C-alpha cells in the first residue's frame, strides 16, 4: 500500500502535475516525487441557524439551507523511498444550482501541514503551488469566488494531523495574513486570481445592504456573529418618543476583523454573468475516515499515530494509507 495506489481524480492529477512541474524546474537534488489524492467527497447542507431563519427564511427572503460538496485532499512526498504526508485540506464547494448568496463559491474549512517537506527552502513555495493550483482548477470549472478565514490553531491544538513536532511553530496572525497575501500576489501575477479584498472592502463595494446577501458557510465565523447580533438586538426595548440595525452591526464587526477574511475573485466582470452550469467531473468518494477532520484525529490518538518527527510521521502516513484502502 502507498499514496500512488490511492484512486485518481482530475483535481488530484491537476495538483500533483503543477507541483512536480514546479519541482523539476527547481532541479533541487534533496526533493522527491509528490502525490496528491482526494480521499473524501460528499454532498452536505448548511442550515440557516434560528436567528436568521426567523428573520429571513420565514419571510421567504432567503433559502432555508445551502447544498455544497465537501472534499478532503492530502499531499505526499517520497523521502528515502518512503511516503510522507505533509499537507491536508478540507474545502466546501457551492455550485451553480446553489441559491444566492452562496452560488459558485469555494470556502477552505481547514488546512494543515507537518513541516518535514524536503527541502526547507521550497516548502512555502510548494504549499503555494497547491493552493494556487486549487484556485486555478475551480476557476476553470466556473467557481467565481474563493473565501479564506486566516486563523491559526490555538497552542497545542491540531486542525488535521495529530501531535505536531514540538519545534513546528504556529504562525501568529500578522505572519499568517502576510503568508496568504504572498500566495494571492503570485496567483494575481499568473492571472488566475483577478483580485482580492478584505471582507469589509468587498461588502462596501458590492453595496451589501442586508445580512442575507453575505455568503453563509458551515462552521464559519459570520453565521455565529449573526446569531449573537440578532440576540443582542431583540433584548432592546424603547419607551415612546417625542434590521438596518443588524446591517450596522455586521458592518462594525467586518471592520474590526477585516484583515482575517479574504474574498478572492477568480472570474470578474461580464465573463462571470453568462457562465454555463458547474459540472464536477470527479465522482463522490465515501470515506467515513476523512468525513470532517475529527475521525482522523480520533484514529490517530487511538492507534498512537503522531506527526511529531520524520520517523513517527513516516510511520503514521503508512498506517493512514493502510486504513484508507481497507475501508
Ligand atoms: C500550509 C501550512 C499549514 N500549516 C499549519 C500549521 O502550522 N499547523 C500547526 C503547527 C504547529 C502545531 C502545534 C501543536 N502543538 N504543537 C506543539 C505544535 C499545530 N498546527 C497551519 C498554519 C496556519 C493555519 C492553519 C494551519 C502553512 C505553513 C505556514 C504558514 C504561515 N505563515 C501558513 C500555512
Ligand atoms: Cl485553516
Swiss-Prot record:
Where in the cell? Cytoplasm; Nucleus; Chromosome
Record PTM:
Acetylated on Lys at up to 17 positions by intermolecular autocatalysis. Sumoylated; sumoylation in the transcriptional repression domain (CRD1) mediates transcriptional repression. Desumoylated by SENP3 through the removal of SUMO2 and SUMO3.
Effect annotated for changing residue 109 to R: Loss of activity
Question: Impact of altering residue 217 to A?
Answer: Abolished acetyltransferase activity
Instruction: Cite the effect that the entry attributes to residue 180 to F.
Output: Abolishes autoacetylation. Loss of acetyltransferase activity
Q: Which segments constitute the CBP/p300-type HAT domain?
A: 1-327
Q: Where is the signal peptide?
A: none
Binding of acetyl-CoA occurs at: 111-113, 123-124, 170, 175, 179
Modified residues annotated as N6-acetyllysine in this record: 49, 186, 212, 236, 239, 241, 249
- Describe its assembly: Interacts with HIF1A; the interaction is stimulated in response to hypoxia and inhibited by CITED2. Probably part of a complex with HIF1A and CREBBP. Interacts (via N-terminus) with TFAP2A (via N-terminus); the interaction requires CITED2. Interacts (via CH1 domain) with CITED2 (via C-terminus). Interacts with CITED1 (unphosphorylated form preferentially and via C-terminus). Interacts with ESR1; the interaction is estrogen-dependent and enhanced by CITED1. Interacts with HIPK2. (Microbial infection) Interacts with human adenovirus 5 E1A protein; this interaction stimulates the acetylation of RB1 by recruiting EP300 and RB1 into a multimeric-protein complex.
Q: What is said about the domains? A: The CRD1 domain (cell cycle regulatory domain 1) mediates transcriptional repression of a subset of p300 responsive genes; it can be de-repressed by CDKN1A/p21WAF1 at least at some promoters. It contains sumoylation and acetylation sites and the same lysine residues may be targeted for the respective modifications. It is proposed that deacetylation by SIRT1 allows sumoylation leading to suppressed activity.
Q: What's the stated role of this polypeptide?
A: Functions as a histone acetyltransferase and regulates transcription via chromatin remodeling. Acetylates all four core histones in nucleosomes. Histone acetylation gives an epigenetic tag for transcriptional activation. Mediates acetylation of histone H3 at 'Lys-122' (H3K122ac), a modification that localizes at the surface of the histone octamer and stimulates transcription, possibly by promoting nucleosome instability. Mediates acetylation of histone H3 at 'Lys-18' and 'Lys-27' (H3K18ac and H3K27ac, respectively). (Microbial infection) In case of HIV-1 infection, it is recruited by the viral protein Tat. Regulates Tat's transactivating activity and may help inducing chromatin remodeling of proviral genes. Binds to and may be involved in the transforming capacity of the adenovirus E1A protein.
The disorder this protein is implicated in is: Defects in EP300 may play a role in epithelial cancer.
**Name the record gives this protein:** Histone acetyltransferase p300
The organism named in the record is Homo sapiens (Human)
Q: Which gene encodes it?
A: EP300
Q: Which residues of the full protein are shown?
A: 1288 to 1661 of 2414
Amino acid at each position: 500500500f502507498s499514496a500512488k495506489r490511492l484512486p485518481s481524480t482530475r483535481l488530484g492529477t491537476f495538483l500533483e502535475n503543477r507541483v512536480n512541474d514546479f519541482l523539476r524546474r527547481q532541479n533541487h537534488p534533496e526533493s522527491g516525487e509528490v502525490t496528491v489524492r482526494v480521499v473524501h467527497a460528499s454532498d452536505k447542507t448548511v442550515e440557516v441557524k434560528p436567528g436568521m431563519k426567523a428573520r429571513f427564511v420565514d419571510s421567504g427572503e432567503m433559502a432555508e439551507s445551502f447544498p455544497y460538496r465537501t472534499k478532503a485532499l492530502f499531499a505526499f512526498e517520497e523521502i528515502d523511498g518512503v511516503d510522507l504526508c505533509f499537507f491536508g485540506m478540507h474545502v466546501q464547494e457551492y455550485g451553480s444550482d446553489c441559491p444566492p448568496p452562496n452560488q459558485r463559491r469555494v470556502y477552505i474549512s481547514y488546512l494543515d501541514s507537518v513541516h518535514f517537506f524536503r527541502p526547507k527552502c521550497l516548502r512555502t513555495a510548494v504549499y503555494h503551488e497547491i493552493l494556487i493550483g486549487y484556485l486555478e482548477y475551480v476557476k476553470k470549472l466556473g467557481y467565481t469566488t474563493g473565501h479564506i478565514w486566516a486563523c491559526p490553531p490555538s497552542e497545542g491544538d491540531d486542525y488535521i494531523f495529530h501531535c505536531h513536532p514540538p519545534d513546528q511553530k504556529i504562525p501568529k496572525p500578522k505572519r499568517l495574513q502576510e503568508w496568504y497575501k504572498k500566495m494571492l500576489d503570485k496567483a494575481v501575477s499568473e492571472r488566475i486570481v483577478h483580485d482580492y479584498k478584505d471582507i469589509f472592502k468587498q461588502a462596501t463595494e458590492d453595496r451589501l445592504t442586508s445580512a442575507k446577501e453575505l455568503p453563509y458557510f458551515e462552521g464559519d465565523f459570520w453565521p455565529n456573529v449573526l446569531e449573537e447580533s440578532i440576540k443582542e438586538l431583540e433584548q432592546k426595548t424603547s419607551k415612546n418618543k417625542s434590521s438596518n440595525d443588524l446591517s450596522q452591526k455586521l458592518y462594525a464587526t467586518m471592520e474590526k476583523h477585516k484583515e482575517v477574511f479574504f474574498v478572492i475573485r477568480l472570474i470578474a466582470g461580464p465573463a462571470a454573468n453568462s457562465l454555463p452550469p458547474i459540472v464536477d467531473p470527479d465522482p463522490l468518494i465515501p470515506c467515513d475516515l476523512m468525513d470532517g477532520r475529527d475521525a482522523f484525529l480520533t484514529l490517530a490518538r487511538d492507534k498512537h499515530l503522531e506527526f511529531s518527527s520524520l520517523r513517527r510521521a513516516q510511520w503514521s502516513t503508512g498506517c493512514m494509507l493502510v486504513e484508507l484502502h481497507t475501508q
